[PDB]
């Protein structure tokens, strides 16, 4: 199921300050190397928010988990029925992102269907005003188990590059719960390291983003 290359489909429907938009992405994932190759397309015209603010929202089941940490891989253990990924993202001196996604297998394709909602964003801010650089700094995240909520939690921050040279933080509050509320693997505390590369397709005329992502788990010998 995750031994070789798995095709990926991402569907995002959301709106920020009432500005509706949709994003569709296609690609493939390689969990053996924690590698992800995707191409996202804004199917409603121009994206009202910068692409770097949607990378974390747009599939941790493809993260590289070494053998000694296979007993702590919640994302793969919930497959193929899948899990739910809820997030509350708070942007520094700006609005909030509220997302809910379902990551499961629909046939031979790993599907991530998301619903986003941004509340009370400044129309002249860095988000709605498109003042961020086309980059995403590397970051780590602490993963902990939630025996009471029958899932896992994760709180981490992202450093976004502003075009004026400054740095804007985005506090992420993540919660994952298996689809169906069935028996869940409770992992020990560990870390997830991410590396992202954002580029453009020289033949694509629509608003899009090409992404090369590398996710690796660590913290348990």
């Amino acid at each position: 199921l995750f031994t070789g290359v798995v095709p990926i489909l991402v569907e995002l429907d959301g709106d920020v300050n009432g500005h509706k938009f949709s994003v569709r992405g296609e690609g493939e994932g390689d969990a053996t190397n924690g590698k992800l190759t995707m191409k996202f397309i804004c199917t409603t015209g121009k994206l009202p928010v910068p692409w770097p603010t949607l990378v974390t929202t747009l599939v941790l089941c493809f993260a590289r988990y070494p053998d000694h940490m296979k007993q702590h891989d919640f994302f793969k253990s919930a497959m193929p029925e899948g899990y739910v990924q809820e997030r509350t993202i708070s942007f520094e001196d700006d609005g909030y992102y509220k997302t809910r996604a379902e990551v499961k297998f629909e046939g031979d394709t790993l599907v991530n269907r998301i619903e986003l909602k941004g509340i009370d964003f400044k129309e002249d801010g860095n988000i709605l005003g498109h003042k961020l650089e086309y980059n995403l700094n590397s970051h780590n995240a602490y993963i902990t188990a939630d025996k009471q909520k029958n899932g896992i939690r994760s709180n981490f921050k992202i450093r976004l590059n502003v075009e004026d040279g400054s740095v804007q933080l985005a506090d992420h509050y993540q919660q994952n719960t298996p689809i169906g509320d069935g028996p869940v693997l409770l992992p020990d505390n560990h870390y997830l390291s991410t590396q992202n590369a954002l580029s453009k397709d020289p033949n694509e005329k629509r608003d899009h983003m090409v992404l090369l992502e590398f996710v690796t788990a660590s913290g348990i010998t």
Side-chain angles (χ1 to χ4, degrees), residues 57 85-87 89 97-101 114 116:
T57 296
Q85 176 159 298
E86 284 184 82
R87 275 223 196 93
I89 305 168
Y97 274 1
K98 309 267 289 197
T99 74
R100 188 195 189 277
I114 319 145
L116 188 139

Side-chain angles (χ1 to χ4, degrees), residues 134 163 171 200-201:
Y134 195 60
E163 273 160 10
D171 304 348
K200 296 289 189 177
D201 185 16

Side-chain angles (χ1 to χ4, degrees), residues 66 68-69 72 187-191 217-221:
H68 288 2
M69 301 184 62
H72 312 266
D188 281 350
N189 293 355
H190 63 285
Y191 283 92
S218 73
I220 304 177
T221 78

Side-chain angles (χ1 to χ4, degrees), residues 25 51 83 95 107 128 136 139 173 188:
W51 283 105
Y83 54 85
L128 282 184
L136 186 63
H139 73 280
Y173 299 92
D188 281 350

Side-chain angles (χ1 to χ4, degrees), residues 14-114 116-146:
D15 72 278
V16 178
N17 284 24
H19 308 305
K20 296 186 95 289
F21 66 98
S22 298
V23 170
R24 201 174 204 264
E26 287 159 318
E28 48 175 50
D30 192 1
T32 306
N33 301 312
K35 181 179 115 269
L36 168 125
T37 48
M38 294 286 303
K39 181 185 180 182
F40 301 92
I41 298 277
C42 178
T43 53
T44 59
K46 174 165 175 51
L47 202 63
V49 313
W51 283 105
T53 68
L54 296 184
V55 175
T56 54
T57 296
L58 294 159
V59 277
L60 304 186
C61 49
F62 291 103
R64 169 182 167 247
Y65 268 84
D67 300 328
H68 288 2
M69 301 184 62
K70 281 174 170 292
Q71 292 187 300
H72 312 266
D73 194 344
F74 153 85
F75 309 104
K76 286 191 196 58
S77 69
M79 293 305 172
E81 191 173 11
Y83 54 85
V84 187
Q85 176 159 298
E86 284 184 82
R87 275 223 196 93
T88 291
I89 305 168
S90 174
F91 291 88
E92 182 175 9
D93 316 315
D94 218 327
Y96 316 88
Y97 274 1
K98 309 267 289 197
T99 74
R100 188 195 189 277
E102 290 204 340
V103 188
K104 62 182 179 301
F105 268 93
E106 294 181 0
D108 297 328
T109 297
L110 193 274
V111 180
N112 182 26
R113 198 164 285 104
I114 319 145
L116 188 139
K117 183 63 200 123
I119 49 164
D120 310 319
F121 272 92
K122 293 171 176 293
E123 281 288 337
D124 60 310
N126 298 333
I127 317 297
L128 282 184
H130 302 279
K131 306 192 197 309
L132 296 188
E133 304 271 4
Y134 195 60
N135 286 92
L136 186 63
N137 283 316
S138 305
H139 73 280
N140 287 16
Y142 201 41
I143 311 287
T144 59
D146 207 357

